[PDB]
Design a protein around this ligand. Structure first.
Ligand code: SF4
Ligand code: SF4
Ligand code: SF4
Ligand code: SF4
Ligand code: FCO
Ligand code: FCO
Ligand code: F3S
Ligand code: F3S
Ligand code: MG
Ligand code: MG
Ligand code: NI
Ligand code: NI
Lengths: 551, 267, 267, 551
């Protein structure tokens, strides 16, 4: 029996502490704690509704774009503004390209080093490594020569004695199961992923004005001026440049990231039977394509007790059933008001009193949906799409399963997706489907401009009296995001963000029910309590973002 | 041997680290494998928890007097520093300890350079700048939300290649990046001079690439290189070129203080 | 099927073809494999001599009314066309023949757009523009020496995607690229306005990026997109940004006529 | 005998006609003809000496940069100006990076389809093609997967029925000797070459202000403002960016281009025994690194009657022996004045009278060196470096020979370099050595700036009276270039360019001696006189540039 603390958890965004009780070599109880707060909700209060997005985008630079888009959607909701369709195409391209960068970096830069042993890659035979991928991937950069070059980089770094950020990693740990060759393949793909993500961000930059932190939004649409014949504006040449980057993303996503995902499952199949965080899942529909903030390319919904057959679809960001269900509690958080609060009536009054196992232990609030704990993010979003019968999602999951089948002789059932690996799989499936979103929306934009529609912005009016409440939903890389704005006498009187990592990372709730991170850890085997790699494996699967969770 | 770097994040959103992932000269992979030894960075480190704090302590000792310390985010002083706690201690303490043996100290981003968005409005956490936390030290400020990553990387490179920081202004900002008002090197200056202004996004002048002053452009009161160096190395990409006014994110008292559409003072 | 293009070089230096090798959207490989079918281009053709001339004749027939004809270089009329002879015939005859069945006709570069360098001075060969030799036809002019290749490629793409040329000015130049004076969208305009001028290369003001008017900048009298689209898609690259005045290469009567250091007229 | 004409010769720069008499399938006599003239020498006359470079750069856009650099060197020579060393470093980087692009494009885009049969590539086995390169190259993009993708690109093009620039190629010609697999490898490399040359031109652009046609020179130095601390000028960030592209060139050059050159020699060894154009060779030293227009990184010299042991070194661009030896004749060219002319006294008076086998047949003049015909270009420059005992050149040639020997069991001797393949080899050697020039000169620049030297320009004075003469030499991609300027009363009173393809492509001279192209073709076997591929193979080895040859 013993108590461990993992502080800092690295290879996430932000500041997280994880505590675990270990009994008989298995985690029996866990605590998740966000250890930094800024008070972004209070910072944005009393300002013009139009200014909020530029401020609140700074909730997070990893999931840049997301809080900007949710904020303008929230003001647009309060104000009853229908966004021009060209502005929707542009917003959608940005969100899809951003999310591509985000998921690739998560799988490689943030998560791979939980599963991959770089020291072991030094023992690999590069020709055997390449030979292992024959008939498994068509990627053009899996040669023995590529792998030898990558192995020599690792050799040179080790030889210099300055391992820096690769130092004191979990090399030789008994939970490291990859052969030398597979470790080497992973490091080569880690480096290749950096090129792909850079291309995805060039898409974002050409529409956003830069990234991180785009600067092309407005309450009412976008700031991009569409004019095929204009000098210095969004013309056909600039659109062609955007397209040139969109086209560079697919091969890596399909032939490396998608395949790696199947492969890690094949080597670590025990991780399909652990890390279940919840039995309820929520996602919102995403990528609106009509003139009235609807006709989403991706579907949303709510799954209760893992029952896909009886899930509830969500087709509208104005769905009152979704809106009325959401509350947050601060019973076990460092805020004063503890009873569950609907976010339009939310407060964020700090009340730090130090850590207590049974009291307050986190700056993360505890969200519920009609009083239940819910997992959000790519596992939720994939399960909802499967529940909806979305053929694209089924088909993409089936490709990953076919690779897994070929390597293992076993198949993967939906029951096995409620797991650490299933979570990873939903993320990869989302990244793959996002490449068709990009092609679709680029084409829709070109076609619409050709019909003579260059409209991008409708100037809002904000009544100087009255109180108006708006909510902006967005399916972010880490799950359902919502910004809740109350306007009174022309200014923001309340602003509450309920962020996807709030749902997953939040501490025990008003009824002391356990959040997804904390639940997911129960039952984790921990071979060495001083080096709890297995705990970090499961926590990384949720893609924590603590600037997001706490704000 | 590569020059050591210790990066500590305080009240950061991670956008300043994420700028590195857009960089091309060097790319982040060439940065960490060739240019520097990144001895501590929580976003990319293999080690976590006890193991990573070991790395940091070892590196602070081993490279005493030699490492560049980089901080992103503001440092919250309210209530004895408890608004940012790492390994059970206030981040202000981690920063002051690391500062003691640093060869050079860099505030990357507006938050660490002057408080930024985290210090704005009522400043709920009493967030302050890195220079405020380190009164006896020269802190090089690389502001922006986030800066073009090469404003940072070429500062580090100057230290490495020539052995001293680049030339700095009166706010300790490198002159190659922050030496001039955006409006004193903006390609839309001719339109400003002629009274050719966009009045609303999507209007005819906006669609001809006219000046954004009457949309709230803060270029007249913001020092930076956004109109020249721009972003992402693709050519032609900065907020104004895309159609939106500068918000003044580089500049204390402008960004996160003034409304998007509030007009700038013109010198 | 891909839209067919026939490219004929007259008194060309090949710089206008070479511009395609710097292009990125599309790259030249994607242009020729995906975007168009390049039915005749002597620089890249596998076939030579009688075989490539057979290709041309076959394409001119097969694609009659459908191909874009592109010409670089000037057309020399002196002495009955003999200053450019291909397969034993004056190039003006090849061009007139190919123009008969063209869907659209483009003069890429200053030489074909207005005579360019080859028509300067005493004009040894009586070099003229493509429009001069095709009086009955609307020739789309894409000037510059050479233009940014995307000035061409996005013109072609507009024809392909939307079925007509881009909007043109009264010199039949695409407005997205030539619609504005360089000086009416130049980032050094603030310096011009303040009287901040480089007087010699390497002087203090030049080394601060000041205006190049007193070095002979022709931006005030040259239409183009050099300050915004710039060159090579790397960011920040055009003559003035590098430190040298605009020479006026886009603009008839400016480039190749006025001396580098001769002052421009300002409107 | 049979008479054939090849007009136009394609896959060159400019307008070339080649005629051949063929006796029993062997070329017995040939004629080279430049068929386009502009009169660039006359266009630039009567202007300020400072303006020449911008105008005469437009002699050629393939060898962009070269005429600009030679022109400023010529004005500097006339005026006795010593160029600042920073200006030399910058000119040097531009020329070396340009020449990297130029040579890569010549081997792949211009020349490879003489030797490579794309149809045959359709029959290749991609896996076998990849296996052929094990132990022959370490290039990372030689996988079967890369090769299959390329093969499918060819397949898709053929199936479209729109072959375009690949239509009516010499597919199945009896002189095509490569196996299917090697044809497929070459196509893959042709496409990869396009990426590499684009990176080379990014170097050129960041110093030149664009390319084609740089814009950063001056009589007196360069227009780049060196200030590490300056906004909007050549600072450390910009230099770092330049370096990032310099670093991207070497692997393709060394692991692909250099290797393909050896391999082509291995499959076509009979091409080591034909295409000799001359017995005399000339090159000028290049890449000056001192403050006095000297201390060249590459050596120059004159080889007479192929005797390397008795060659004459040339170490200065003011070498009187070099200067006084150069003349040009128009006896068989379409100009009026026919006796050999020193270029300071040259005329260019057009006198077109149509084609005559025994009279005038070309717009190219006939240059001589002390009355002899001379080949210039990479064969000349390699042979001179070998005569000089330059170890770098020796070693690089030995690397090519080692690959050739691995494939064939045979070595190569210097005698075998006086040939079509020797000329191609010389070019490749040059491209490889140029990568070290780039590293050397980038490091020299960074070091010099570090010492506090930011100087880049010496403002000239030009006497308003007097007559004075200057000559600017340059070792261009195609060989020795010289621009000859006479200034009288402050303006250009004569201007003569003697260009490398003028040496090589010029017609029979005042003594009816045959120039390199014409000489090289004697003995060429021609299997099919309707499709004289063998003739074009030899002609292309000289990298003709007719805008250059004629101006
Ligand atoms: S400066 Fe901006 S991008 Fe950097 S930490 Fe602060 S909010 Fe984030
Ligand atoms: S106000 Fe803004 S857009 Fe207008 S010239 Fe100044 S910096 Fe440029
Ligand atoms: S326009 Fe310029 S680059 Fe194009 S052919 Fe004429 S001289 Fe050459
Ligand atoms: S004169 Fe030239 S450098 Fe100066 S502002 Fe005008 S275009 Fe720009
Ligand atoms: N993705 C993301 Fe960030 C979190 N959690 C948001 O929204
Ligand atoms: N290289 C080149 Fe052009 C030729 N011939 C010049 O000089
Ligand atoms: S908002 Fe910031 S990024 Fe530049 S354009 Fe203005 S200083
Ligand atoms: S010389 Fe030409 S390339 Fe542009 S900067 Fe001036 S029009
Ligand atoms: Mg909240
Ligand atoms: Mg001449
Ligand atoms: Ni986030
Ligand atoms: Ni040339």
């Amino acid at each position: 029996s013993q108590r461990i603390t993992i502080d800092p958890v690295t290879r996430i965004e932000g500041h997280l502490r994880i505590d675990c009780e270990i009994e008989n070599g298995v985690v029996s109880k866990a605590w998740a704690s966000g250890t930094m707060w800024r008070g972004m909700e209070e910072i944005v209060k009393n300002r013009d509704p139009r200014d909020a997005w530029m401020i609140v985008q700074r909730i997070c630079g990893v999931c840049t774009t997301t809080h900007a888009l949710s904020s303008v959607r929230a003001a647009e909701s309060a104000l009853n503004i229908d966004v021009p369709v060209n502005a929707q195409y542009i917003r959608n391209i940005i969100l899809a390209a951003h999310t591509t960068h985000d998921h690739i970096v998560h799988f490689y830069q943030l998560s791979a080093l939980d599963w991959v042993d770089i020291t072991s890659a030094l023992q690999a035979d590069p020709t055997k490594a390449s030979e292992m991928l024959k008939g498994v991937s068509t990627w053009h950069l899996n040669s023995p020569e590529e792998f030898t070059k990558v192995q020599n980089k690792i050799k040179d770094l080790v030889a210099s004695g300055q391992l820096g950020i690769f130092a004191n990693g979990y090399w030789g740990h008994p939970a490291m199961k990859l052969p030398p060759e597979v470790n080497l393949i992973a490091v080569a793909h880690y480096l290749q992923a950096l090129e792909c993500q850079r291309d995805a961000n060039r898409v974002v930059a050409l529409l956003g004005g830069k990234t991180p932190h785009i600067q092309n939004l407005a309450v009412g649409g976008v700031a991009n001026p569409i004019n095929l014949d204009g000098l210095g504006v969004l013309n056909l040449e600039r659109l062609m440049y955007i397209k040139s980057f969109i086209d560079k993303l697919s091969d890596f996503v399909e032939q490396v990231y998608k395949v790696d995902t199947a492969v890690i499952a094949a080597f670590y199949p025990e991780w399909l039977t652990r890390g279940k965080g919840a039995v309820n899942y929520l996602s919102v529909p995403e990528f609106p394509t009509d003139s009235k903030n609807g006709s989403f390319l991706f579907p949303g919904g709510y799954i209760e007790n893992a029952d896909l057959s009886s899930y509830r679809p969500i087709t509208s960001h104005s769905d009152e059933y979704l809106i009325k269900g959401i509350q947050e509690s601060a019973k076990h958080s460092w805020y004063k008001d503890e009873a569950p609060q609907a976010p339009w009536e939310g407060t964020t009054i700090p009340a730090y009193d130090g850590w207590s196992d049974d009291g307050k232990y986190s700056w993360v609030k505890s969200p519920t949906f009609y009083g239940k704990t819910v997992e959000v993010g790519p596992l939720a979003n994939m399960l909802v799409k499967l529940a909806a019968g979305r053929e694209s999602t089924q088909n993409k999951l089936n490709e990953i399963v076919a690779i897994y089948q070929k390597l293992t002789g076993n198949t993967l059932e939906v029951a096995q997706l409620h797991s650490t690996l299933g979570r990873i799989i939903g993320r990869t499936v989302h990244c793959c489907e996002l490449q068709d979103i990009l092609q679709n929306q680029y084409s829709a934009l070109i076609t619409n401009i050709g019909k003579g529609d260059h409209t991008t912005f409708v100037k809002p009016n904000i009544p100087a009296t009255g109180e108006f409440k708006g909510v902006g939903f967005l399916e972010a890389p880490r799950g359902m995001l919502s910004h809740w704005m109350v306007i009174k006498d022309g200014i923001i009187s309340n602003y509450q963000a309920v962020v996807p990592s709030t749902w997953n990372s939040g501490p025990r709730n008003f009824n002391d029910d356990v959040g997804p991170y904390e639940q997911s850890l129960v039952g984790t085997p921990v071979a060495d309590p001083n080096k709890p790699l297995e705990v970090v494996r499961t926590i990384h699967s949720f893609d924590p973002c603590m600037a997001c969770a706490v704000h | 041997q590569r020059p050591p770097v210790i990066w500590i994040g305080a009240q950061e959103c991670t956008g300043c680290t994420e700028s590195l992932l857009r960089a091309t000269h060097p790319t982040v992979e060439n940065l960490v494998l060739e240019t520097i030894s990144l001895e501590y960075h929580e976003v990319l480190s293999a080690a976590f928890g006890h193991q990573v704090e070991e790395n940091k302590h070892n590196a602070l000792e081993k490279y005493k007097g030699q490492y560049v310390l980089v901080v992103d985010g503001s440092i919250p002083l309210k209530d004895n520093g408890i608004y940012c706690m790492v390994a059970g201690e206030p981040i202000v303490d981690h920063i002051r300890k690391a500062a003691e043996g640093a060869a050079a100290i860099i505030a990357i981003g507006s938050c660490s350079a002057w408080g930024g968005v985290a210090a704005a409005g009522v400043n709920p956490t009493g967030a302050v700048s890195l220079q405020e936390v380190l009164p006896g030290k020269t802190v090089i400020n690389i502001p922006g939300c986030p800066p073009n990553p090469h404003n940072f990387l070429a500062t580090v490179a100057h230290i490495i290649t020539y052995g001293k920081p680049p030339k700095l202004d009166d706010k300790n900002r490198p002159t190659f990046a922050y030496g001039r008002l955006i409006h004193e090197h903006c390609e839309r200056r001719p339109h400003f001079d002629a009274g050719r202004f966009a009045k609303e996004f999507g209007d005819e002048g906006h669609r001809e690439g006219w000046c954004l002053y009457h949309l709230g452009c803060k270029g007249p009161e913001t020092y930076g290189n956004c109109s020249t160096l721009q972003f992402c190395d693709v050519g032609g990409v900065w907020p104004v070129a895309i159609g939106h006014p500068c918000y003044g994110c580089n500049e204390e008292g402008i960004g996160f203080h003034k409304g998007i559409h509030q007009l700038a003072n013109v010198e």
